Design a protein around this ligand. Structure first.
Ligand SMILES: Nc1ncnc2c1ncn2[C@@H]1O[C@H](COP(=O)(O)OP(=O)(O)O)[C@@H](O)[C@H]1O
Ligand SMILES: [Mg+2]
Lengths: 459, 161, 600, 109, 232, 459
């Protein structure tokens, strides 16, 4: 029960950016928590980043402004930030540090969990299978999502990634032949977006099963490093102890990665690509992999994190390292957005690793796998046709190129374009798929076995 | 073409000629000032007073625990007094005990009008407070006023910014 | 109460014997008492960011420790005044020092204490009344345009014990006395607020009202809203400063705070000369513009550290007026110069840099700056509604929108007014790219537009489709040579030119294009789109007949209509008012319809 | 417009260099087509169809030479410059890291 | 565990401070709009707020009551309840010379209270238009324009006192349009000022629209101004 | 004044590149000047760029070759580089260190001014409202020069930017239908360039109003970043204390930037682009912004900071950061020079920020602004037509396109081509404008209102 009084120090060595360095500390514990009382009485908290001898470096979440080097009192908790968690956290809004913002009380500690995460034994991990029917043809048709997957949405600044994520949340469900709890971690989100999501959950009547963690763009930038760990810790309680199915939305891992960069620079760490810490891979893996099913439980965690891509690229370290950890992506593009297409999802650079197993006879439709592959290849070819047309002109194309060009134009208009308040089923999506495939003569559909064509193609 | 480039050269040289003459006049004044200072140095009753100040002034600039005062040998009896009367004051203005010695082996050149130079213990830090050094140090800063005082103010200057 | 200077590396000064000093406290460095702010604490030594040139500062110079953080004085006497980067009035310096240069170490009150202000209380308070933060207990008549509300500062409350009767009071007197629990507070008209702290509001509201800009493009195609944030990352010569000046001169905002952070010195003089000569009628009376504007000058050749103080002073001033129920539209014409200051200081600090030498926390500073914009419900019992908009320029090197500042800015701001250097070279002003720009407030304003206009929205959509279609064609036309174009495509290409040359560009230094009332923009757009639809119909209904109306036929037949459409800009809204302009545009529509009937 | 607008990378260098080689090969093959048509055209002097084929071929060749390749070369030069700029900022940080390590080592002595 | 609650958007202490003010504000508004406590229906509707005011309470005692939950401490709900009264106060005060019947005041209260968003409603816009007219005239020279605005504004105030602002009565609607147009009209353009005023007077159905609205001394100046203009 | 004797040190701690580090210094002053003597009697000077405790870092102007560690003798002047200035500096030739090289005496000061200068109070700065007649149609018409404007000429190695600057020095007058004091900073140039200008100034018969500062290619690279400040400091004396109108020309500013880059590398400062210091902009502003009129005084400073563009790259940091600070640029190029066009001024990428105030009723002629804007439109379109015709051939052009080629060809030979001694008035330039604009029918002159065309177009 740690019934041992805590030591409080005024032995501040110095303060450098977001970091406070203390000396003369008795047996510093790594990743311990320190409560700081500023000379004016303001309380703030921080977590130890490293210890050495009698010195410790504390990462202050709310910020270091106003801290002096003589009077600030630093109380060492003696433990690791184990956060209070409760099943009744749903229907609540918390700030980035897990404190009430909704005029409710402090969450009552039904239990405590170490936010660092408790690794799950791969031997007991259960492979996900059941498909989530998101309502979005670009996802349910081609890049389907299994329950327990990890499929982030890439986007650049200005794109409607908040609308797609909101659409998935309210349209989420299973392929039918009861619903998800939402754990919503906002990291560096502006107020206009914050009310967009909050209002959407209220208007659809979802708040009974929604827990928000709001770290806004105008809130402290160090705090958001823990926010996603608090969000997933609650998800793990609800999914693995309370047998709920939880959908976890992380509004931006890029502002999270930047927050890590701010700390990494502050402690004069050796960076890797573009100034980010060499351990970014691990810091992301320890959050992304908190997903999936485990033997003996009925609940699950599905993650759909969002990442803003600097400079509209996908080789930036942030999306690059994420791609190596997560199981595909959605990739929201800009060329489709500029053409007033919604959802503006580009099917070519986007994949879903679990798609090959979460579909097919017994889960969706016999032809699901064949329709997806053929449409993808046709789209890829259509794009190569446009690349030629841009040089040789529309008068220099052959009959097959025109069929691929007509397919491409109709594909985006009839298949990808949907609208934010219309959901289509996986079976309706495939029926549309066939309407687009039937543009081609059967001889050109080289990626669909003849048996499938004879059953579906002439319909 | 040839006439106007030749007249330009001639006018440019005439400008340089009068400018050089003006600088000669400034030099004559400074050389007279040097001789006037020498005449003052020859007066024990005023030169000893200068030395009293000049030694103490250098001591305040170094603020070292050990001082070596170097002078021309001819004036040593007065530098000795200047040091003796300077230490009680130093220990009051700075609240620091200073060991001030006079160098009896190294002397300033005999052609120095007067004054002292003071070295710290290791001779790495020195202050030069002789009469020639002071004359140039001040004259170079007062020159803007000398220019006006001798030749008149510039009628075209209206602002002092 | 003093420290001592230990070392100087430029804008950064290191001081010792300051064990009790806190971060972001003000200090006075040197015998001239230069203003600085503590950045780091290392034992009993402090790292000081100094907002004045440190030349001549010696080791051992005193450093005065001031408990108050960097703060701005807020009260009457701001409007019409120009301040430096740390809220020292330039008109008071020049009137007191008689110099033309700004001396270093000048300690001048931000707001004059000699002026006898005309003060009227709210007449609703009595002794014993309970007053809370944001309450207004009187108004000062600064001028005929802005009524200056005297508010109880945030984080202050209590019972009223005395309220000054109406009369003439200066800023050193006591207007309100209030007590809480024994402790009594005496307030004048001037409150102090740290510039780095966000002034609290009751609720941040969605922005649902246009920010009127005296431009055709930057309004019809890419609207900005009251409380919104936008960026203009133009290259040198793109005319982004002129866009900022145009918005300041001719908008529907109540107060403009113009921040010249790293700007050329001539630009601030330009404003001070020109603005007093502008008019804005209030209630039938002609009044000058300066009475509703204020500006901060921290020019490019001024202390680089002061560029951070200038930005925060500007937005803090903007919030102050926001709290009084006014719509503020401040603009800092640089952003990159602020981030540049952060880079130079970070270098002197020997910090580990991030992307392209900029501090890792660059994004943190920009995010917290821009989020102070927005339409809000104010604190205070009187239930005020205000806004702060931020229109911030960015200066990407080479015009390449890839630097950390442009990239981070685009991830924060909701309206992107991208400028194209290749349009500025053609004097196609404003040099708006119109292909990469966007505004995320289109949906927010759709309700407004339907209420007042209706016709505007489908015209906006058709105009974008025409411009985008022209770009899609231009890509291939460069290679084909206009040989394979259909007649329906040639119409698009030439109408798109009509839009580009006559609608998207305007000369802001003319009596007719200096301000473009919205009714004129949508009026002349309706005619241009109406031509498009009628010309496209003319060929669509005849292409399969026994005579196809090609562009060359309509071009020669209707050449007078094409000239009239191009002339629609030359309407001089000040000499010829709304009634003549609308009637004129109606005549052009009739002329087109009659010419088409004779053509088809 | 002026550049293909591919974000600077070593991958972009490989793609742009392959794209440039392709454009140059197409330019040379089309130039040979034009020369063959021009010789046949002069030998004949189905005559106007050769004049039309030559005008179309030469126009495409001119575009490759005046529009597409210059644009690839500007893009490639842009990429090369920006990559060296990224190399420099890495050099700076590594140099400062080495100096900070040296300072730590001196303090330890 | 309360290091940084940031309740809604304010520090807890600032939130509760705002609650204390709003309670006092409503009490002040009720005493200002209804000095005699005649509006029994509305005072009862605020009884749960006024019970904490009009009594010898200290500021700290009300602040404690908020923190302890002994008073209506829901600031967002309390703000809505305050606004539907603030707009009623300015409605009555902006027409000071012409008092409303108590039945009309209570009717206007309910009409605004039941509105989904009073701030953005037509009630607020009409009040803003009225205050633009009545605020200008607080300090103005006795010019032709200002004498015409004085006469026309008093009529607008009279009609509002009779009908209120919930019904789109043609009388107040025309008066708003003409009043705002005349006020906007440039001060030197007297020919339009006289045209608009004279056209108004002989467009109203009344033989003498100002009879009983403004005093005889203002009627003498009002008519003399027109007489002088038409004299040459 | 400073009456206390200055101290002399033999306490050099060490030498690292161009920086000599002293210890045991009494109360070091930041940005103070140190005079040092080498063991062989050589005298050199430098400035303290950093102080810390008893240490000071001195950057030596002449260089650090031959600097000793035990015998080096240094003395601290006790102030910043304040330099002697007098009215009679006009007609003198100085080196980059401020010393005379014309065999005349040293400067007999009227005062001592801080080389760093002070920023001019923006409230007393008066916006320029007078035009200078350069006599060059390419400038006076389409990119006018105001008195108090900052207008560099962007050039490239081998182009006649020295001849244009020399021409401007002789035929720069007023459009009020005047003797400018010229301060010429010749830095980073060869002997022939400095002799060219020196000879031209004498050839013009104006040498008595010209002050030269020379710092040649074979002179120290550190003095090259004070030479501009020496020129401007004198200009400030002449303009703001003696009410003399001054024209300040700074030769290839790129040698300033390169000298600065060397210093930046030596001091290990944070780079921005192409290795230049991240504060390059701020340093340039210190140089450039020393210009303009001041209210209440009858003087002015006009700058022409000509610079060479490395590899004709208009986006190189030097022209880029200059373009952000100065009121536009003249810009010459090789496409005009390679055709023996003089002056080779390309108007298209050029601008004058103060030009809009400078033109028009009360300044030149009321049609000035209209003629300029239409000439820009017609010139740019002609360039666009050439880009088209290069591919499609002359046969693909219509009469609307050939007119722009006729304009473009006549424009460059009639408007831009003049000759080194062709001095045109601003009124003649506009008349030429109309002669070229009248190539097109009224309907194509879309930048000019009919209220102007009806008066001027008929002629
Ligand atoms: N909207 C505009 N209307 C008319 N002229 C403009 C406009 N924008 C820019 N210009 C012209 O181009 C110049 C460049 O604009 P400026 O704001 O100085 O560029 P920058 O983008 O560097 O701030 C202006 O001084 C003016 O002459
Ligand atoms: Mg600008």
């Amino acid at each position: 029960y740690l019934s041992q009084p805590r030591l409080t120090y005024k032995t501040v060595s110095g303060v450098n950016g977001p970091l406070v360095i203390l000396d003369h500390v008795k047996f510093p514990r790594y990743a311990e928590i320190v409560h700081l009382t500023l000379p004016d009485g303001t309380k703030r908290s921080g977590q130890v980043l490293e210890v050495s001898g009698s010195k410790a470096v504390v990462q202050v979440f709310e910020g270091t402004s106003g801290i002096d080097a003589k009077k600030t009192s630093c109380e060492f908790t003696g433990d690791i930030l184990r956060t209070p968690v409760s099943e009744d956290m749903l229907g609540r809004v918390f700030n980035g540090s897990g404190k009430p913002i909704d005029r409710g009380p402090v969450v009552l500690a039904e239990d405590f969990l170490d936010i660092m995460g408790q690794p799950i034994n791969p031997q007991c991990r259960i492979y996900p299978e059941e498909m989530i029917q998101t309502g979005i043809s670009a996802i349910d048709g081609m890049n389907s999502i299994a329950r327990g997957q990890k499929i982030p949405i890439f986007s650049a600044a200005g794109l409607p990634h908040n609308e797609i994520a909101a659409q998935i949340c309210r349209q989420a469900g299973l392929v039918k032949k009861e619903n998800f709890a939402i754990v919503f971690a906002a990291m560096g989100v502006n107020m206009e977006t914050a009310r967009f999501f909050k209002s959407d959950f209220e208007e659809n009547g979802s708040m009974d099963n929604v827990c928000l963690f709001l770290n806004l763009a105008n809130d402290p930038t160090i705090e958001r490093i823990i926010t996603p760990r608090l969000a997933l810790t609650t998800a793990e309680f609800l999914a693995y102890q309370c047998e709920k199915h939880v959908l976890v939305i992380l509004t931006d891992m890029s502002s999270y990665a930047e927050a890590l960069r701010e700390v990494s620079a502050a402690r004069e760490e050796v960076p890797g690509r573009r100034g980010f810490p060499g351990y970014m891979y691990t810091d992301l893996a320890t959050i992304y992999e908190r997903a999936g099913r485990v033997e003996g439980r009925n609940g699950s965690i599905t993650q759909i994190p969002i990442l803003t891509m600097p400079n509209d690229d996908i080789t930036h370290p942030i999306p690059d390292l994420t791609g190596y950890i997560t199981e595909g992506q959605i990739y929201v593009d800009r060329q489709l957005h500029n053409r007033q297409i919604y959802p503006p999802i580009n099917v070519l650079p986007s994949l879903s690793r679990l798609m090959k197993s979460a579909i097919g006879e017994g889960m969706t439709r016999k032809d699901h796998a064949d329709v997806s592959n053929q449409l993808y290849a046709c789209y890829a070819i259509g794009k190569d046709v446009q690349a030629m047309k841009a040089v040789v002109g529309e008068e220099a194309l052959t009959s097959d190129d025109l069929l691929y060009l007509e397919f491409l134009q109709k594909f985006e208009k009839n298949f990808i374009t949907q609208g934010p308040y219309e959901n289509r089923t996986v079976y309706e999506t495939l029926d549309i798929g066939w309407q687009l495939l039937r543009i081609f003569p059967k001889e050109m559909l080289k990626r669909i076995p003849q048996s499938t064509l004879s059953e579906f193609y002439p319909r | 073409q040839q006439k106007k480039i030749q007249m330009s050269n001639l006018m440019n040289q005439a400008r340089l000629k009068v400018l050089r003459a003006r600088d000669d006049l400034i030099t004559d004044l400074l050389n007279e000032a040097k001789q006037r200072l020498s005449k003052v140095v020859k007066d024990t009753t005023r030169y000893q007073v200068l030395l009293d100040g000049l030694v103490l002034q250098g001591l305040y600039q170094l603020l070292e625990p050990r001082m070596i005062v170097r002078c021309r040998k001819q004036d040593f009896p007065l530098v000795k007094a200047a040091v003796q009367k300077a230490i009680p004051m130093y220990k009051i203005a700075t609240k620091k005990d200073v060991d001030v010695q006079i160098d009896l082996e190294a002397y300033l050149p005999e052609d120095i009008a007067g004054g002292v130079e003071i070295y710290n213990g290791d001779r790495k830090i020195k202050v030069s407070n002789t009469l020639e050094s002071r004359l140039d140090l001040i004259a170079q800063q007062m020159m803007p006023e000398v220019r006006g005082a001798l030749f008149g103010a510039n009628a075209n200057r209206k602002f002092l910014d | 109460t003093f420290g001592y200077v230990h070392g100087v590396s430029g804008p950064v000064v290191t001081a010792c014997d300051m064990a009790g000093a806190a971060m972001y406290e003000l200090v006075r460095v040197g015998h001239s008492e230069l203003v600085g702010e503590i950045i780091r604490l290392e034992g009993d030594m402090a790292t000081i960011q100094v907002y004045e040139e440190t030349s001549g500062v010696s080791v051992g110079d005193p450093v005065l420790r001031t408990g108050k953080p960097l703060s701005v004085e807020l009260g009457p006497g701001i409007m019409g005044a120009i301040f430096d980067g740390i809220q020292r009035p330039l008109s008071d310096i020049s009137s007191q020092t008689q110099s033309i240069y700004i001396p270093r170490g000048v300690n001048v009150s931000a707001l004059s204490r000699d002026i006898k202000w005309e003060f009227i209380p709210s007449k609703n308070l009595r002794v014993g009344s309970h007053i809370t933060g944001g309450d207004i207990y009187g108004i000062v008549n600064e001028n005929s345009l802005i009524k200056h509300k005297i508010m109880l500062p945030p984080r202050s409350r209590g019972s009223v014990t005395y309220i000054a009767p109406p009369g003439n009071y200066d800023a050193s007197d006591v207007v309100l006395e209030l007590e809480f629990e024994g402790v009594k507070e005496k307030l004048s008209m001037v409150q102090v607020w740290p510039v780095r702290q966000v002034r609290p509001v009751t609720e941040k509201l969605p922005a649902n009202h246009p920010l009127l800009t005296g431009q055709r493009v930057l309004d019809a195609l890419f609207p900005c809203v009251q409380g919104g944030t936008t960026a203009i990352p133009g290259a040198f010569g793109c005319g982004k400063t002129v866009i900022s000046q145009s918005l300041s001169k001719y908008s529907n905002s109540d107060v403009i705070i113009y921040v010249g952070c790293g700007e050329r010195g001539n630009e601030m003089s330009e404003v001070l000369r020109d603005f007093p000569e502008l008019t804005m009628e209030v209630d039938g009376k002609v009044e000058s513009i300066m009475k509703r504007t204020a500006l901060v000058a921290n020019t490019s050749n001024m202390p680089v550290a002061a560029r951070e103080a200038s930005i925060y002073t500007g937005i803090t001033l903007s919030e102050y007026f926001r709290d009084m129920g006014y719509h503020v539209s401040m603009m800092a014409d640089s952003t990159s110069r602020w981030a540049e200051a952060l880079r130079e200081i970070s270098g002197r600090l020997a910090e580990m840099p991030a992307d392209s030498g900029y501090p890792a926390y660059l994004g943190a500073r920009l995010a917290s700056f821009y989020e102070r914009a927005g339409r809000v419900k104010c604190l205070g019992n009187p239930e005020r509604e205000g806004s702060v908009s931020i229109v911030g320029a960015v200066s990407p090197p080479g015009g390449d929108f890839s630097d950390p500042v442009t990239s981070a800015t685009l991830g924060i701001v909701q309206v992107f007014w991208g400028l194209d250097k290749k349009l500025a070279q053609r004097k196609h002003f404003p040099s708006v790219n119109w292909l990469i720009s966007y505004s995320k407030y289109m949906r927010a304003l759709d309700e407004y537009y339907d209420k007042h206009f209706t016709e505007f929205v489908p015209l906006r959509t058709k105009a974008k489709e025409i411009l985008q279609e022209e770009e899609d064609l231009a890509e291939i036309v460069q290679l084909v040579g206009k040989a394979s174009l259909a007649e329906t495509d040639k119409i698009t290409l030439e109408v798109a030119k009509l839009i580009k040359d006559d609608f998207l560009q305007q000369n802001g230094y003319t009596p007719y294009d200096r301000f473009c009332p919205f009714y004129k923009t949508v009026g002349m757009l309706s005619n241009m789109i109406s031509f498009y639809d009628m010309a496209r119909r003319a060929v669509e209904t005849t292409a399969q007949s026994d005579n196809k109306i090609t562009w060359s036929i309509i071009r020669e037949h209707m050449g007078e209509i094409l000239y009239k459409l191009s002339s629609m800009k030359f309407k001089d809204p000040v000499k010829d008012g709304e009634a003549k302009i609308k009637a004129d545009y109606a005549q052009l529509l009739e002329d087109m319809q009659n010419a088409f009937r004779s053509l088809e | 417009k002026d550049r293909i607008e591919i974000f600077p990378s070593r991958m972009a260098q490989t793609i742009m260099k392959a794209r440039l080689k392709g454009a140059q090969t197409g330019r040379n093959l089309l130039k040979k087509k034009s020369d063959a048509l021009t010789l046949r055209f002069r030998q004949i002097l189905s005559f106007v169809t050769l004049d039309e084929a030559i005008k179309i071929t030469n126009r495409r060749v001119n575009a490759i030479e005046h529009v597409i390749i210059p644009r690839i070369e500007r893009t490639l030069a842009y990429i090369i410059t920006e990559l060296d700029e990224r190399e420099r900022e890495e050099f700076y940080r590594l140099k400062k890291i080495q100096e900070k390590k040296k300072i730590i080592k001196e303090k330890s002595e | 565990i309360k290091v940084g609650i940031k309740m809604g958007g304010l520090t807890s202490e600032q939130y509760h401070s705002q609650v204390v003010g709003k309670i006092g504000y409503i009490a002040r508004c009720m005493q200002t709009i209804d000095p005699e406590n005649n509006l029994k229906k509305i005072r009862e509707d605020y009884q749960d707020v006024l019970i904490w005011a009009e009594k010898n309470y200290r500021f700290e005692e009300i602040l404690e009551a908020s923190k302890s939950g002994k008073c209506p401490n829901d600031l967002d709900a309390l703000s809505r309840r305050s606004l539907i009264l603030q707009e009623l106060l300015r409605l009555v005060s902006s027409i000071s010379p012409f008092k409303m019947k108590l039945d009309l005041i209570e009717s206007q209260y309910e009409k605004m209270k039941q509105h989904v968003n009073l701030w953005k409603s037509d009630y607020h816009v009409k009040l803003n238009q009225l205050n633009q007219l009545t605020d200008y005239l607080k300090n103005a020279a006795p010019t032709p324009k200002n004498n015409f605005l004085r006469a026309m504004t008093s009529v607008l105030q009279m009609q509002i006192a009779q009908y209120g602002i919930t019904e789109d009565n043609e009388g107040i609607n025309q008066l708003f349009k003409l009043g705002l147009h005349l006020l906007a009209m440039a001060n030197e353009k007297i020919d339009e000022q006289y045209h608009l005023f004279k056209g108004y007077v002989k467009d109203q159905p009344e033989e003498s629209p100002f009879e009983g609205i403004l005093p005889a001394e203002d009627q003498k100046i009002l008519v003399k101004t027109m007489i002088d203009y038409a004299m040459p």
